[PDB]
Amino acid sequence: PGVLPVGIDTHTATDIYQTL
Amino acid sequence: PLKIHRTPYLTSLKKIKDEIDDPFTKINTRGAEDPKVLINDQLSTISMILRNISFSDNNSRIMSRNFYLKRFISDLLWLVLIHPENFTCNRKILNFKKDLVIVLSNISHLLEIASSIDCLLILILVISFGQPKLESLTFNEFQLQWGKYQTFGVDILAKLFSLEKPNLNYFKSILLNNHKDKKLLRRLLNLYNRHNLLNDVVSFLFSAIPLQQVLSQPSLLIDQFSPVISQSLTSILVIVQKILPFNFNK
Amino acid sequence: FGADWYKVAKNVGNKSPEQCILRFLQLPIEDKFLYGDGNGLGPLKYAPHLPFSKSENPVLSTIAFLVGLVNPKTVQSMTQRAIQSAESIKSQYRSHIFATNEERQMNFLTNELIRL
Amino acid sequence: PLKKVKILEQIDENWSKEDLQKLLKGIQEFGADWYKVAKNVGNKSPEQCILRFLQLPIEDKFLYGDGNGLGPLKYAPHLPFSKSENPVLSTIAFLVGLVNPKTVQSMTQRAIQSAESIKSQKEEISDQKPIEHIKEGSEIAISSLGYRSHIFATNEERQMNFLTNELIRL
Amino acid sequence: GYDINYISKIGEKIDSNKPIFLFAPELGAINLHALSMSLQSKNL
Amino acid sequence: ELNENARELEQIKPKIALQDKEITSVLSNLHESNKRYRFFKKISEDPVKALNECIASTSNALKVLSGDEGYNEDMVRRANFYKENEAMLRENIEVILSNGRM
Amino acid sequence: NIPSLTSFAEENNYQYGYTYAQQQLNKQRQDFERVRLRPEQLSNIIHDESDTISFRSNLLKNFISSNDAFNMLSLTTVPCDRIEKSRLFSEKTIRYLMQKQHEMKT
Amino acid sequence: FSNKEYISRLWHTLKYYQDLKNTRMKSITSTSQKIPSASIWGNGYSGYGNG
Amino acid sequence: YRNFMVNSYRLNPNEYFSVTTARRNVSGDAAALFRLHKFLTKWGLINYQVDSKLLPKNIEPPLTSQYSTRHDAPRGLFPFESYKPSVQLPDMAKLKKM
Amino acid sequence: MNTSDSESTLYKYLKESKRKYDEIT
Amino acid sequence: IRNINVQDALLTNQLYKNH
C-alpha cells in the first residue's frame, strides 16, 4: 500500500462542490 | 431481405446469458432514457397481453379472425426474423418468438393463413426451435429436460395442416417450389440454404418424438408425451401423403 | 402569489398559464453558478452514486479524474506504438502464443491425434 | 512569465550533470527495476528518478497552481501549505514504473533517451504551460495502463488455450 | 469502497417494497371501454 | 451376455460421470477467462473510451443495485435540458394542470 | 365431447348485440375448451433457463468481477518483464500425448 | 457519503416503504370489508359514465 | 355539426342528448349524423354524466391524504438532492480560497 | 469562515499550518 | 403457459375426421 499511490477522495470532492 | 436470421434456441439462450453477464451491459438503460427501448417495451407488453388473452374459449375464436390481429402477427413475424436489428435487447427477440408460438398454439385450429409469406415465416419460426447438426436428418433430437417450447410448434403444424384450401395450398407451394410478393417469396426461398425446407421440416418433426428417451429407460414417459407424439405423427403423415407426390432431384 | 398559476397568469395578462409555467421552468437561474458550459465534469457528473475509494482503489479514482484532460487519439497512438515496439523487441498463424518450435509441434501433434 | 522558468528549473531543481549521467547509466543498463537505478544515483528515490526521467516536477502544486482546463482537480482536497502528498504525480510515477523504460523512450519523444539528448529535449519542452505537463504525463500513464492491459489480455488468451487443450484431453 | 453484498441484500427488499405500479387486488373496477378508448388517444 | 454388457456399462458409467464433472468445471473457467480477456482487450484497444464505459457502467451498476432511480441530477439541473425537451413539457404541463395537480 | 367445427362458427355463437341445439352445443364447447385452454396454476412456471435469470445477481457478480479484475491490472505492481508466462499444457495432457504418440504406430 | 452513512440511508428508506406497504394492505382490506377507503393512488373514476 | 352537438349537450348535462333531436335540428342525412353522434359519445364529450353518482366518504389511512408529505420521506424520484455540508478545517480553508 | 476575525478557527488554524511548515522548513 | 393436453390431440383428430 505504501508503494501504491494515494488517490483523490471523491466523496469530499463532491461536497466542496455543492457547498461552494 | 438480406439474411434470414435462423438462430436456434440454445444459441439464443447462450447469447442472452453472454449479454446479461457482460460488464458494459445496456439491458437496464431504463425507459425514459431512450425512446427506442420505450417502443420495444410497449411492443413486449403488447405481446404479453396478447399471449395472456388467448387462454379463453371465446377469445380464441374471436382472435382467430380480427383481420387486425392476423395482420399484426404477419407484421411482427417479418420483423423478428428478417430485420431484428431494431429491437434493442436480445432477450426481447427471443421473448417475441416465445409468445408468438404460444398465441399461435391456441388460435391455429381456426386460423386461415392469409398470405404465402406468412405461411413461410410460420415454418421458419417453428423450425427455429430445436438444434441442428454440423444428406441425412439435419436435426439432433431435442431431449425434454430442457424446455417444452418446441412441443408448441408441432401443434401449430398439426392444426394448420387440417385445411385443404389456403392452409395446405400455401404449404404445398412453399415446400415443393399479389405481384410484389411473387418477387419476395422467390427471394426468401433461395435465401434459405434444393428441397432443404422439406427435409428440415420433416427432420424437425422427427425430433420432439423422444424415441431415444422413452426407449432408453416405461409407461410414464409415453403417458406424458402421447399428445406431442400423436400430433407430430399426424403432421408427418400429412406431409408424406399429401405433399410428396415432379421436380425433385434427391 | 406562490404557485397559483391562474392568479399569476392573471397578473401577467395576455398569456395562458401553461406558458407561464413553461417559461418559469426554462429560466437559466443556476446555470451561471455551475461548473461547465454545457471538457467534462468527470465522476462528479455521477453525483449521488460514487463507487470509488481513496483507500481501496487509489489508482482508479485518480484515473477517473485524469481521463477528462487527455486526448484519446494520442493515447491510442502511444499504446499502439508501445505494442509494436514490444513486438519488434520480441521478434528480435498464432505464433505470438506458440513462439517455441516445441509447442507448435505439440499443437500439430494434438491435431494429428484428433484426426486419427 | 516567471511560471515558465519556474517549471523549467523546477524540473531541473536538484539534478546536476553527474546525477543525470548516473541516472541514464542505470536506466539504459537496468530494465524496469527503479530501485537499483535510485541506488545508482544514490541520494534520490525511485519515484524522483522516474519523474526526472519523464521530465516532470514534484510536490504537485507547481502543476495547477491556481484552484480552468483542469475540470474536477480544482475540487480535490489537500493538506494545505504542508504535508505534500501528490496523488496525480505518484499515480503517474507508479504507472510508468512498470512498463520497461526503453519502450517508454520508444513511446514518447519527450522522455530522456541519452546523455547527448538532454539539452535539445529540455529546449523543446520549454515555453509550455503547467497544464501541458499534466496532460502529457497523464497521457503517458494511461498509455502504459493500456500496454499493461494488452499484456494481461495475451496472458489470458494463453490461459484459454491451456483450457482448450485440457478440454480436448478430457 | 462499499460492502456491496449487504447493500444489494438491502436493495432487493427496497426494490420489492417500492411502489412501482398497482397490484392485482387494488386495481378497482377495471373498465375495458376506458382502456380501449385510451389506447386510441395517442397520448403517452 | 446382455447382463454381462449391462454390468460392464454400469462399471464404465461413473468414470464417465467424474470426467463430465471436470469438463463442466473447465468450461466454466473458460467462460470466466473469456470475460477477463474481453475486458483486458477493450481497454487496450482504446484506453479513454473503455475507461469511460468502465466508470459509467459502475456507478450505474451501483444505482440499480441500491434501488434508487430517476434522472441524472447533474443533467436536469441546467437550462438547456428544458429547451431541448420543449415538446414533452407542453404535454405534461397541460396534463397536470387540466387534471388539477399543478 | 370433442364438439365440432360447426360449433366454432360465428353463426352459432354470440356476438356484440347492441335455439336448443345451439344452446346444447355451446355447453359442450365451453366445457371442452375450458379444460383444454386453461393455464397451469401450479409449479413448473420456470419454462426454461432464460426466464428465471436474475438481473440483480448477475449485476452484483459483474460488479465484483470488474472490480477484482481491475485490481488485478493496476494494483499488481509486477513489471512487464517479470510477469511469468503460464504453461500451455498440463501435467496430465503432457502424459496423455506421450502415451498416445507411443501408441500411434498401431 | 461513506459506507456507514450510505447503508443508514437505505435503512431509513426501506423502513418507509414497509410502512407504506402496511398502509397499502390496510387500504385493500378496508375496501374488501365494503368500506370505501382511499389508496396510495387516487380514486380512479366517479359516477360519470365510467363506473 | 360537432360544435352544435357539444354546445347543445353542455347546456343540461343530466339529459341524454339523443340522435333524433340532433337530426331534427340540423339539416343532413340521418346516417352521417348518427355516425358522428356515436363517435362523439364514444369518446366521452357528450352523454358522459347523464346518471352521475356520489362517492360517499373516504376513511383515509395515513400517507394517503393531501398534505401527507414529509421532509423525512425518501426521494426515490424527484431527482434533486439535498447534500451534506462537509465541515473539515482544511476543506474550510479550501472553501475560503475557492 | 471569516479571515478578518482573529478568533475564528480559520485564522488560528491557517497561522498554525504556515508556522508548522516554516518550522519544519 | 399451458402444457399440451390430450384434448388438443383429440380436437386435432376431430378436425382431420370431420374434413
Numbering used by the authors:
A (entry chain A): 481 to 500
B (entry chain B): 876 to 1009, 1021 to 1063, 1078 to 1093, 1102 to 1125, 1129 to 1156, 1183 to 1187
C (entry chain D): 542 to 579, 587 to 640, 666 to 689
D (entry chain E): 513 to 579, 587 to 689
E (entry chain B): 676 to 719
F (entry chain H): 465 to 566
G (entry chain I): 37 to 54, 67 to 154
H (entry chain C): 368 to 418
Which sentences from the paper describe this structure?
SWI/SNF is the prototype chromatin remodeling complex and regulates the expression of 5% genes in yeast. Within SWI/SNF, Snf2 functions as the ATP-dependent motor that drives the fundamental DNA translocation reaction underlying chromatin remodeling, whereas many of the auxiliary subunits target the enzyme to specific loci of the genome. To understand the mechanism of nucleosome recognition, we report the cryo-EM structure of the yeast SWI/SNF complex in complex with the mononucleosome. Based on the specific biological activities involved, the SWI/SNF complex is delineated into three functional modules: the motor module, the actin-related protein (ARP) module, and SRM.
Most of the auxiliary subunits are assembled into the SRM, which is further delineated into two lobes, the DNA-binding lobe (DBL), and the histone-binding lobe (HBL). These auxiliary subunits recognize different features of the DNA and histone components of the nucleosome, and collectively provide the structural basis for chromatin targeting of the complex. DBL of SWI/SNF is composed of multiple elements, including Snf6, the N-termini of Swi1 and Snf5, and Snf12, which directly or indirectly bind to the DNA. HBL contains two important elements for histone binding, Snf5 and Taf14. A fragment of the C-terminal tail was found, which folded back and sandwiched between Swi3 and Swp82 at the HBL. Intriguingly, at the periphery of the DBL, we identified an IgG-fold domain of Snf12. Because the SWIB domain inserts into the β6–β7 loop, the IgG-fold is barely detectable at the sequence level. Structural comparison indicated that this IgG-fold domain shows a strong analogy to the YEATS domain of TAF14. This YEATS-like domain is ~9 nm away from the exit DNA without any steric hindrance, which would allow binding to transcription factors in a manner similar to the SWIB domain.
